[PDB]
Coordinates of C-alpha atoms in Angstrom, one line a residue:
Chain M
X1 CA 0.0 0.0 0.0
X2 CA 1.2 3.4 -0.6
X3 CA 0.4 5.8 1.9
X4 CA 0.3 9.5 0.8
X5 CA -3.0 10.8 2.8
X6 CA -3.6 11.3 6.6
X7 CA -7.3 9.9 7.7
X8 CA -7.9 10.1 11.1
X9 CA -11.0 8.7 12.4
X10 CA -12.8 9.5 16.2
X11 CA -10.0 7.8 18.5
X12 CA -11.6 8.6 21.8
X13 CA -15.0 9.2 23.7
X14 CA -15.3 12.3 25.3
X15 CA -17.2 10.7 28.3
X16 CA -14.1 8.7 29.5
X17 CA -11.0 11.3 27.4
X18 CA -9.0 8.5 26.3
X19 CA -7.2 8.5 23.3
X20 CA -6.5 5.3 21.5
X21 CA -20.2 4.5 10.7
X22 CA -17.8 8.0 11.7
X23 CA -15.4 6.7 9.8
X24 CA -13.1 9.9 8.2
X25 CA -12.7 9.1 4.2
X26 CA -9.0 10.8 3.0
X27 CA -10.0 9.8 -0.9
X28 CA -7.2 11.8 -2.6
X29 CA -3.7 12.0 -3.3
X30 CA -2.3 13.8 -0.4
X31 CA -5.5 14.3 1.2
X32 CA -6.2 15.0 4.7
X33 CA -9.5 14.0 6.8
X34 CA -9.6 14.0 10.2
X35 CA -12.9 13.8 12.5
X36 CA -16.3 12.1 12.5
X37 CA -17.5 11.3 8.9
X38 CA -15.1 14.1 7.8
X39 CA -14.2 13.7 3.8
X40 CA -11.0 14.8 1.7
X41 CA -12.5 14.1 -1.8
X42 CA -9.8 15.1 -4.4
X43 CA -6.7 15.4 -4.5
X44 CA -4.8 17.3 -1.3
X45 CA -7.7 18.6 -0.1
X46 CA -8.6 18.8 3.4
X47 CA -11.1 18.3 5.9
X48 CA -11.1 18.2 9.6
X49 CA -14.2 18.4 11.6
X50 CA -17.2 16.5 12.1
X51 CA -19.0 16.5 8.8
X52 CA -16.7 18.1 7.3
X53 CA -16.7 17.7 3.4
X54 CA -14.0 19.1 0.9
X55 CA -15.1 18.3 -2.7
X56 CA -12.8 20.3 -5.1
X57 CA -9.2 19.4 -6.0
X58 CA -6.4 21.2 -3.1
X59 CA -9.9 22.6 -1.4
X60 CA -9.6 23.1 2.5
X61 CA -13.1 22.8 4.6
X62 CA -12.6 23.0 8.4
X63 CA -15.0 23.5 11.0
X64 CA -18.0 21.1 11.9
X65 CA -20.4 20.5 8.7
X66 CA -18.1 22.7 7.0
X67 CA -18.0 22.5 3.2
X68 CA -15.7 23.4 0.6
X69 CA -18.0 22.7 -2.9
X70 CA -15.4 23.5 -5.6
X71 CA -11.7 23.4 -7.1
X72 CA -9.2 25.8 -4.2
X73 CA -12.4 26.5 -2.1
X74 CA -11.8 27.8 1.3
X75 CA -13.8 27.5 4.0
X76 CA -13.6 28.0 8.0
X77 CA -16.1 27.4 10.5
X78 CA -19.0 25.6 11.9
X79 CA -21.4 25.5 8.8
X80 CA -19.5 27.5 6.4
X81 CA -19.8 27.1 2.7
X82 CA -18.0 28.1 -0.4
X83 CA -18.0 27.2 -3.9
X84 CA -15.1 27.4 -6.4
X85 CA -12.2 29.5 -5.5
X86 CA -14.2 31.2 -2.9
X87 CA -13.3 31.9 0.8
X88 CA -15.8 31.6 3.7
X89 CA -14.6 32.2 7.1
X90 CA -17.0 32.2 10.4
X91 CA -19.9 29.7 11.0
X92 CA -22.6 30.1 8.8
X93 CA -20.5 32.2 6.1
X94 CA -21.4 31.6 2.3
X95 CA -19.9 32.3 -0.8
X96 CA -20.5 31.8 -4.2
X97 CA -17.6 31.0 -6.9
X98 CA -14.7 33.3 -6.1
X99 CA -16.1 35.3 -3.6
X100 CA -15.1 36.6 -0.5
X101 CA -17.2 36.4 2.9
X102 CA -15.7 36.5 6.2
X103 CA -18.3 37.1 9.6
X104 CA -20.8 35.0 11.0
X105 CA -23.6 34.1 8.7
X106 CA -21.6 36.7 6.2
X107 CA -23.0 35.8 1.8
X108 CA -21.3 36.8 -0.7
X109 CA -24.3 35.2 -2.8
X110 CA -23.2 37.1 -6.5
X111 CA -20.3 35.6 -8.1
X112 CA -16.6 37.5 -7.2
X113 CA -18.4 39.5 -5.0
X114 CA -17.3 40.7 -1.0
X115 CA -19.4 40.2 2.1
X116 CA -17.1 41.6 5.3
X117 CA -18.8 41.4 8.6
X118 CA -21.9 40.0 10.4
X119 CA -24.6 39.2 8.3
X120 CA -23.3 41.1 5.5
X121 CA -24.7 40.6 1.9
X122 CA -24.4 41.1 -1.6
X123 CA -27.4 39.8 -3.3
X124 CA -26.7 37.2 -6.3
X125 CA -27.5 39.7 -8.8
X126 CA -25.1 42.5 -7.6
X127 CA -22.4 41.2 -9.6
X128 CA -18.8 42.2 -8.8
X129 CA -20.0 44.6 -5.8
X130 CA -18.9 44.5 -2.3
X131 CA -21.1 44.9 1.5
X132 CA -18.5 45.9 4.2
X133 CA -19.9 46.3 8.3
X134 CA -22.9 44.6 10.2
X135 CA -25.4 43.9 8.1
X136 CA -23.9 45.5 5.4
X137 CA -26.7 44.9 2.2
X138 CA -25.2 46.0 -1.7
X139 CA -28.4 47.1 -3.4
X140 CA -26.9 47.5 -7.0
X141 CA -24.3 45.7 -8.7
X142 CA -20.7 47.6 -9.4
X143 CA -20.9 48.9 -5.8
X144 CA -19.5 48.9 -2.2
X145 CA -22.2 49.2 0.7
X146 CA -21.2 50.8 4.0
X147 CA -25.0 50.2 5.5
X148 CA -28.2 49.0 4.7
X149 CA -32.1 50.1 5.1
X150 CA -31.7 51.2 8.8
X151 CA -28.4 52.0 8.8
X152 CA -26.0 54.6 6.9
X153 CA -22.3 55.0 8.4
X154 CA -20.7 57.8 8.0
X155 CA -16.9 57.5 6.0
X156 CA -13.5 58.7 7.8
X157 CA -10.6 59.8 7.8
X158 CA -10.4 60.2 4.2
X159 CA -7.9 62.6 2.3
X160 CA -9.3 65.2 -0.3
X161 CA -9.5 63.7 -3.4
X162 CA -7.5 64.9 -6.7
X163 CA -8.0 62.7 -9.9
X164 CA -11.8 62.9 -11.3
X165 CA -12.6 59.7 -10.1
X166 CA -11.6 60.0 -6.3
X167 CA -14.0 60.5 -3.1
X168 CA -14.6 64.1 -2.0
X169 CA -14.4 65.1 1.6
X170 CA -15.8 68.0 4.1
X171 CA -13.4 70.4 3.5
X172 CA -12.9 69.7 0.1
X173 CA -16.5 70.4 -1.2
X174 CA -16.6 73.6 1.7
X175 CA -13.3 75.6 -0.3
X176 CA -14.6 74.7 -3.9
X177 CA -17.4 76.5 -3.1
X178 CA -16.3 79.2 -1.3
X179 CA -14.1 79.6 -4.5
Chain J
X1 CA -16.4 2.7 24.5
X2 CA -18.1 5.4 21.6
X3 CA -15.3 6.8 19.7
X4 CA -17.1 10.1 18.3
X5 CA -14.1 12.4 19.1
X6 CA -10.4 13.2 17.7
X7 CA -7.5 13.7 20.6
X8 CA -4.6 14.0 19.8
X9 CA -1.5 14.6 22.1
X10 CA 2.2 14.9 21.7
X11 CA 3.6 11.9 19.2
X12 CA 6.8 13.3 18.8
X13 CA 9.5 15.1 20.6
X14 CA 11.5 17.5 17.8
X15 CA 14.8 17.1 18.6
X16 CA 14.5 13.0 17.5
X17 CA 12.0 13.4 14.7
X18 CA 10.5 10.1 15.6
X19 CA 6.4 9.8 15.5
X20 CA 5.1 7.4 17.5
X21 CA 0.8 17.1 31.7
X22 CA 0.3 18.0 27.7
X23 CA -2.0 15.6 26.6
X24 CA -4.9 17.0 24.4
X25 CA -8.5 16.8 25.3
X26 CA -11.3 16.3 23.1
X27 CA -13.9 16.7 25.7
X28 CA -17.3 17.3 23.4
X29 CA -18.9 14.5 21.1
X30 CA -17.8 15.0 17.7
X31 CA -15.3 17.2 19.1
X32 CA -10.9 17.6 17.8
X33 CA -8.5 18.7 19.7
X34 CA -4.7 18.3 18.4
X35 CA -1.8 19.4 20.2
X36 CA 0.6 20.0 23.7
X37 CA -2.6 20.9 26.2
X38 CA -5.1 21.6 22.8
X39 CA -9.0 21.5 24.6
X40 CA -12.1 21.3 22.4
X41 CA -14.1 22.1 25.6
X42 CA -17.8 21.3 24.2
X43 CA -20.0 19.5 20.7
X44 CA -18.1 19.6 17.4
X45 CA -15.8 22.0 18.5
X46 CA -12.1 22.1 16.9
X47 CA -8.7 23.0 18.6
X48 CA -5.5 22.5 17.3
X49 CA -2.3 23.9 18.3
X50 CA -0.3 24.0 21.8
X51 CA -2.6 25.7 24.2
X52 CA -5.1 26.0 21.8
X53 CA -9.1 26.4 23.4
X54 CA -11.8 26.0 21.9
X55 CA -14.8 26.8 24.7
X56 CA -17.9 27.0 22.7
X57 CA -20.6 24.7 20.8
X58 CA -19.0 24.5 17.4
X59 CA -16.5 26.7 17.5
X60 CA -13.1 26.3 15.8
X61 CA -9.2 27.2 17.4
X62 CA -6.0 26.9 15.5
X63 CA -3.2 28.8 16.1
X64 CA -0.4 28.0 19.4
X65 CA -2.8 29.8 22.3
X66 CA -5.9 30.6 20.4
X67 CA -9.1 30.6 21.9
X68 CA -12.3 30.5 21.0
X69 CA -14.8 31.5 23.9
X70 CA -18.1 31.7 22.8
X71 CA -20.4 29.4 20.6
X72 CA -19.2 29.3 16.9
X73 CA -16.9 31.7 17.7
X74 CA -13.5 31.1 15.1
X75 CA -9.8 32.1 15.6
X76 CA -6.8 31.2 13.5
X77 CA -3.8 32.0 14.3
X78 CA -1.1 32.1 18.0
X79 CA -2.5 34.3 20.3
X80 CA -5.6 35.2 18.4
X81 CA -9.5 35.5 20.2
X82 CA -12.9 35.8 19.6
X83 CA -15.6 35.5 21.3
X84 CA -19.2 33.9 20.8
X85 CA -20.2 34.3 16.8
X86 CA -17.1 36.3 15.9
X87 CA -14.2 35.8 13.9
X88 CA -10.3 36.4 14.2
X89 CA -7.7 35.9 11.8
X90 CA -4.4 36.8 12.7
X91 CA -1.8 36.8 15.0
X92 CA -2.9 38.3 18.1
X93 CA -6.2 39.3 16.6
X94 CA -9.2 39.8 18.6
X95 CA -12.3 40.6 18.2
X96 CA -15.6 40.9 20.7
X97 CA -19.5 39.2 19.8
X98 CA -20.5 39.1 16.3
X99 CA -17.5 41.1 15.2
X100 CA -14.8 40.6 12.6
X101 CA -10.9 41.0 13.6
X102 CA -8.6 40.6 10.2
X103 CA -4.9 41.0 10.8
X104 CA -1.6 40.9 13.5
X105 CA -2.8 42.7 16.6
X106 CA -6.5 43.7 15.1
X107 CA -9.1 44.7 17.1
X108 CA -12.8 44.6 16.8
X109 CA -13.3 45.6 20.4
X110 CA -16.7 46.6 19.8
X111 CA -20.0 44.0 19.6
X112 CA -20.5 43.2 15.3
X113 CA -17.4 45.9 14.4
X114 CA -15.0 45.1 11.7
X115 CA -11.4 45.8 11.7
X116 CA -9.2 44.5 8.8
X117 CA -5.9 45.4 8.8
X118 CA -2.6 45.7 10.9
X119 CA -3.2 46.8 14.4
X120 CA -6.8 48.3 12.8
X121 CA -9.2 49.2 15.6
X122 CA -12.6 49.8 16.5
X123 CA -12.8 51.3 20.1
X124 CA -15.6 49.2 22.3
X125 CA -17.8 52.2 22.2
X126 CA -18.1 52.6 18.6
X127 CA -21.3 50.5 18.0
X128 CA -21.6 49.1 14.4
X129 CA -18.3 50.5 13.0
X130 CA -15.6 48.8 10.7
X131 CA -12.3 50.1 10.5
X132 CA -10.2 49.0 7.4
X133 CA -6.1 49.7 6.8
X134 CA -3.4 49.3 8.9
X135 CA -3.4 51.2 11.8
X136 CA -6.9 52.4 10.7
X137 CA -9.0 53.2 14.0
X138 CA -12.6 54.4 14.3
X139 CA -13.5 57.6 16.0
X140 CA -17.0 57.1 16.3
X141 CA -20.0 55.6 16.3
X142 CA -22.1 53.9 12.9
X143 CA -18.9 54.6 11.0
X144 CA -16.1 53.5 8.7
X145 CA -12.5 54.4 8.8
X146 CA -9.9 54.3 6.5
X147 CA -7.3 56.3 8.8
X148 CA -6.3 57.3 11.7
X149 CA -4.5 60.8 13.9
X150 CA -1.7 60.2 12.0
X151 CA -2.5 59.4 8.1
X152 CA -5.8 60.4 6.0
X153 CA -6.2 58.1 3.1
X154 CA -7.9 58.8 -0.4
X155 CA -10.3 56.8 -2.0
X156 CA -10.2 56.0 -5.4
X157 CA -11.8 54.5 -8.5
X158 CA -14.9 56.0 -7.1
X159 CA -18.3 56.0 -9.9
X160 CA -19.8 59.0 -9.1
X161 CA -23.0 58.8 -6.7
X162 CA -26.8 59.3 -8.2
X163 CA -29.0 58.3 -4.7
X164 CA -29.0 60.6 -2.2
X165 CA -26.6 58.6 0.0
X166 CA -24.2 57.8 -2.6
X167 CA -20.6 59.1 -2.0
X168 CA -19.4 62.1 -4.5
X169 CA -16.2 61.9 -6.7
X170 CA -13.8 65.1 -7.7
X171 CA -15.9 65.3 -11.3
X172 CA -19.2 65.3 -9.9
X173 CA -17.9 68.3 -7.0
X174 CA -16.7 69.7 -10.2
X175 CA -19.6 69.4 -12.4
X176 CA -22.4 70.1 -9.9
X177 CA -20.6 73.7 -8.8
X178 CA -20.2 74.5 -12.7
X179 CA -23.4 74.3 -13.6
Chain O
X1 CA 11.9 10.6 24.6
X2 CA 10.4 14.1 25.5
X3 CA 7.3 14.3 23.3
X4 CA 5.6 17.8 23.0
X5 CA 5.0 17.7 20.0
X6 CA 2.7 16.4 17.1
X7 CA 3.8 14.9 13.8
X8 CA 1.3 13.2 11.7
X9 CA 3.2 11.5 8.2
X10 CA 0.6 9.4 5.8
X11 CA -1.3 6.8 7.5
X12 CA -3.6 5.4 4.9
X13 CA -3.6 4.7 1.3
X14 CA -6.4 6.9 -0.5
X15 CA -7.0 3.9 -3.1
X16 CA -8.1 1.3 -0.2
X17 CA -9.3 3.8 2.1
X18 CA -7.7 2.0 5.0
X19 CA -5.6 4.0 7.6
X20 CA -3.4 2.4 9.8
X21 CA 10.2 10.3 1.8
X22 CA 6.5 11.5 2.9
X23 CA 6.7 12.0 6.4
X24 CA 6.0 14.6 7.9
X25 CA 8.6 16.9 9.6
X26 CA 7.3 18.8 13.3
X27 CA 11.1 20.1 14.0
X28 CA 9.8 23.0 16.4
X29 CA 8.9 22.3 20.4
X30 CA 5.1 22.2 20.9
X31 CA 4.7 22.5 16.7
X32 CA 2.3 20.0 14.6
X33 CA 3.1 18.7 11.5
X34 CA 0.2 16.8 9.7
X35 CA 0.0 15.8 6.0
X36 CA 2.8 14.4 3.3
X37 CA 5.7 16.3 3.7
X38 CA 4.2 18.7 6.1
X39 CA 7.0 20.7 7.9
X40 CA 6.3 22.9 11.4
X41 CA 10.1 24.3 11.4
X42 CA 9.7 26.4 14.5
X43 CA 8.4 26.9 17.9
X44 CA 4.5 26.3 18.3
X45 CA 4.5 26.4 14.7
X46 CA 1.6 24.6 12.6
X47 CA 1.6 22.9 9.4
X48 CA -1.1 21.1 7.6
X49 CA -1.6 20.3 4.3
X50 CA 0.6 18.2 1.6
X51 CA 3.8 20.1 1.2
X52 CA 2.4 23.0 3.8
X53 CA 5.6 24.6 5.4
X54 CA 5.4 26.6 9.0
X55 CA 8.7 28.3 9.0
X56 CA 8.4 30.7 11.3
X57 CA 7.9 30.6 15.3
X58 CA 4.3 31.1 16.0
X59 CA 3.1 30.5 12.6
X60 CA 0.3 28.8 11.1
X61 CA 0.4 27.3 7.2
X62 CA -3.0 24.8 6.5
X63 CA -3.6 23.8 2.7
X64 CA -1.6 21.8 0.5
X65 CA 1.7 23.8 -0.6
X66 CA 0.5 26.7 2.2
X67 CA 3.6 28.5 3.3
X68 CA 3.6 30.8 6.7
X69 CA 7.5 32.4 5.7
X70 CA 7.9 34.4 8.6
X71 CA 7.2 34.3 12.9
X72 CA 3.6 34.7 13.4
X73 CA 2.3 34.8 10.2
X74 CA -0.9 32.9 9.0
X75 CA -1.9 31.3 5.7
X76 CA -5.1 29.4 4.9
X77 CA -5.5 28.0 1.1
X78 CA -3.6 25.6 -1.4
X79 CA -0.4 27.7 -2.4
X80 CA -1.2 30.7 0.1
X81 CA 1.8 32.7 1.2
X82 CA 2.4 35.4 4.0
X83 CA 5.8 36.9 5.5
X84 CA 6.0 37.8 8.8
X85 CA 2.7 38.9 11.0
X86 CA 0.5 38.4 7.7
X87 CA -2.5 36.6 6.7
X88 CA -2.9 35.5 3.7
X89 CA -6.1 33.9 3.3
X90 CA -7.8 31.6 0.0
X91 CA -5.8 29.5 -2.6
X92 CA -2.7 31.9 -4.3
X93 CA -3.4 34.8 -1.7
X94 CA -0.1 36.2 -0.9
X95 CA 1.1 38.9 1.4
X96 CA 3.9 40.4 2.4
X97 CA 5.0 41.6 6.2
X98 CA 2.3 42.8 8.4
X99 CA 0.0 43.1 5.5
X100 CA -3.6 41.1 4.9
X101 CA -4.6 39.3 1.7
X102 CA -8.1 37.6 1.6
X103 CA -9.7 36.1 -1.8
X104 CA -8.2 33.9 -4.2
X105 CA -5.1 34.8 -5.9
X106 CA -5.4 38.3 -4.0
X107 CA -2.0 40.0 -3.1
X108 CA -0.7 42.4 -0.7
X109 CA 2.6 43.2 -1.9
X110 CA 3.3 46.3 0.0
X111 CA 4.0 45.7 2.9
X112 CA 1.1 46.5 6.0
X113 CA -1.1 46.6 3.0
X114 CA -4.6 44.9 2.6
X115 CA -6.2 43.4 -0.4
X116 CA -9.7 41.7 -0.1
X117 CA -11.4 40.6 -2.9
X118 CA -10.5 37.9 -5.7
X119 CA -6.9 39.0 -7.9
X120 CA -7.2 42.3 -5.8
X121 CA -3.9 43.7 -5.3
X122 CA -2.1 46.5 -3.9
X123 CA 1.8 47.1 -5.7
X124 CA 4.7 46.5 -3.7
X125 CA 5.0 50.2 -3.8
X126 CA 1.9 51.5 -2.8
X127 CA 2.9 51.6 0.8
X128 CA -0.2 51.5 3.8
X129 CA -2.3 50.9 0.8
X130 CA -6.3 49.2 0.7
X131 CA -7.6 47.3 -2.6
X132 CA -11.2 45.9 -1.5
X133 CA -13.6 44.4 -3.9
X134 CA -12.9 42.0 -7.5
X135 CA -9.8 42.9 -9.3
X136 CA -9.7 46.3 -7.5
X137 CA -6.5 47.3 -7.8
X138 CA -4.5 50.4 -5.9
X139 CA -2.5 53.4 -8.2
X140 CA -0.8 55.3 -5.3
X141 CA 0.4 55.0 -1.9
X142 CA -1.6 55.7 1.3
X143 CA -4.8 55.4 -0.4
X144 CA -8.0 52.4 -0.7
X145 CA -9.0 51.5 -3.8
X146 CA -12.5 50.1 -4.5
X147 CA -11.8 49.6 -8.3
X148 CA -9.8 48.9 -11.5
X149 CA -8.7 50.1 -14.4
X150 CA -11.7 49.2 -16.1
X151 CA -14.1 49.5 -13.5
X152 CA -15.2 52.4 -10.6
X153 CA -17.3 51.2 -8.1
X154 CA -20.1 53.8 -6.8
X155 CA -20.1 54.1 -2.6
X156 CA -23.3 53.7 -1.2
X157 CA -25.1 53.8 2.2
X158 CA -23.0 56.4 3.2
X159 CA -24.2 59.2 5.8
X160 CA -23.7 63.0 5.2
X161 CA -20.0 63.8 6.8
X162 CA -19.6 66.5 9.8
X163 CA -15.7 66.7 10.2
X164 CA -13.2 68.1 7.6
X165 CA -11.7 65.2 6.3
X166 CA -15.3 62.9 6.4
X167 CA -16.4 61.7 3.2
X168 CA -19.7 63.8 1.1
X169 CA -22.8 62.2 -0.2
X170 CA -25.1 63.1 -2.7
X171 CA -27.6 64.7 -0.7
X172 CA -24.9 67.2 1.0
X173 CA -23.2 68.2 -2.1
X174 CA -26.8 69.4 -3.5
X175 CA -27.9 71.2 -0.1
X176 CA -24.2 73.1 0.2
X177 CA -24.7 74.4 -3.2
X178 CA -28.3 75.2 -2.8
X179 CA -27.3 77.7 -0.1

């Protein structure tokens, strides 16, 4: 036999903390799967947690019932999900193929797009747009959402702009128009 | 006895290279705890790493020292916390309930704030707000930051705003005051 | 033998699914080392992942080829790399010292930078720079970017600034002007 993956299945009950059908399933090529019924389908991926599952080709899935659905998908924590080269990180974050959503119960739902923080999301037809804070909601595609329906934030900190496509601040729009 | 859990403590001592008070403890069903003293304290939860803690229902540890203290809560990376449904990524990142602490030494010291970036911070009395940059820090309430006392960044590759909330670029100040 | 740490070389072949110059290399006291070639070099240090190195003390590399480069620094995705106190997050993201790279093949070249978003990127010499969102992509120092060459992305949710150096929406460029 030629051993090139690592599956470790439950070596101990909790109820007595020694270590010696929750069988782990390491079924690729330098594969890793470690926990109850945890799964490494393709090659080198990863999984380790309970019900974990990592179905694409060098995807990593960690976290209980956490599950990376595509080729390079990412995904940590309980319950997070990700498709193809997407990133999910904190339980209950979702993202579609390459997207980015990091919080808890964070969705990136539009393809590419950017869900940062706590229940942030960009709605599957926002495309390439981006929802940044608690509960953070895009509401048109091509954009970047610091709020939502009960919530506008206010932006900081920011220098005055000089080419024609950069943000304006305070004092900026008070001397153009005193000049 | 009902195997359901994954402990697993010191194998190896590093100055031999051989694989054969720090054992690990796997302590909830379903639960993983890998490493010198690693504790997966409760269901499904995941620790790995020396020290590593992982406190709540399903939450997830990995990093030398991390701890996760709260249910779902995730942390990756030495010295990094979070508590219950947040996440923190990073050396010594930290982040409170429901927040979001990316990068070494972030800080999302308020309930659902966002900091992303090196030693970024959102003060614990600045409800809602995300801070994003390094060294970027919130000075208030319901707010984003892209700076701090000591730098003022400009955004760019701004589309010019048509809703009333919508931020303005340099053009449309431009435009607006011409006509 | 003084065993404090945990190294984990290939224990089952993937084409029988039975587990029982591969191994796996946890060199550091306290560090684990899990997966075919997996190497935890330093102190505390964690590797997992086929060909995942953990070279420096404190550092955390999991997904096949993941390398952590410096003390402290954290990767998470096949072929994710971070120097020293970075975090490099998703398959290809890259990052160099102190800086924050999340999405896949997203890259923080400058260092303390931060670039979230799939094949954002911030240029080695845009220093303390932000890129968030798809492709968004910084053209100057001290400065975040929430677009690209071929795309601006419009701001939205944004609240009505107060101090100097606060952003402008919409709704306050019109009133100024009115009066």
């Amino acid at each position: 036999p030629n051993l090139t993956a690592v599956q470790i299945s439950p070596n101990a009950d909790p109820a007595l903390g020694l270590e010696y059908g929750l069988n782990a399933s390491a079924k690729g090529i330098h594969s890793i799967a470690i926990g109850a019924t945890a799964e490494a389908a393709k090659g080198a991926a990863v999984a380790v947690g309970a019900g974990s599952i990592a179905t694409g080709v060098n995807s990593v899935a960690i976290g209980p019932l956490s599950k990376a659905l595509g080729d390079s998908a990412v995904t940590y924590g309980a319950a997070s999900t990700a498709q193809k080269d997407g990133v999910a990180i904190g339980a209950r974050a979702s993202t579609s193929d390459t997207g980015v959503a990091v919080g808890f119960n964070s969705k990136a739902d539009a393809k590419n797009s950017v869900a940062i923080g706590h229940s942030s999301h960009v709605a599957a037809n926002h495309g390439y747009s981006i929802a940044i804070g608690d509960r953070s909601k895009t509401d048109r595609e091509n954009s970047v959402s610091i709020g939502h329906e009960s919530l506008n934030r206010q932006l900081t900190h920011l220098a005055a702009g000089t080419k024609d496509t950069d943000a304006v601040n305070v004092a900026q729009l008070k001397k153009e128009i005193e000049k």
